[PDB]
């Protein structure tokens, strides 16, 4: 049920198309995905997982 919960919170039960992931959201080009990775921080904080 923990993993089912992760499914619930991340899938959302719908593809919104316009919303802010809790953690950004993409455009539709390949090297843009590479850049998307580039702007991600190196060390994150555990509230990204929901964890304290």
């Amino acid at each position: 049920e923990l993993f089912i919960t992760y499914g619930e919170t991340y899938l959302k039960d719908g593809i919104f198309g316009n919303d802010y992931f809790f953690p950004q959201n993409p455009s539709a080009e390949l090297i843009k995905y590479q850049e998307y990775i580039a702007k991600v921080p190196t060390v994150d904080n555990p509230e990204v997982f929901g964890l304290h």
């Binding site: 992760y6 991340y10 593809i15 390949l30 990775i37 060390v43 964890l51």
Partner: protein
């Protein structure tokens, strides 16, 4: 990792390590260099299942790293 492994070839070889990457961005980037450029480029839809790929990839990289 078996000691009592004579070093005849350990003294003359090329050593490489391929345990999975540490950081969230590290694993995410690696995953974005496993199944790419024909999985990604074969779509016939930029809208829905592009988003599904991104969802599942992010899920993968999160649940793996949770164990830290």
């Amino acid at each position: 990792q078996h000691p009592k492994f004579p070093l005849g070839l350990l003294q003359k070889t090329l050593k490489v390590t391929n345990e999975p990457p540490k950081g969230l961005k590290a694993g995410l980037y690696k995953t974005f260099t496993t199944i790419i450029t024909q999985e990604f480029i074969d779509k016939v839809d930029h809208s829905n299942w592009r988003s599904l790929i991104f969802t599942i990839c992010f899920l993968h990289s999160i649940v793996i790293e949770r164990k830290k």
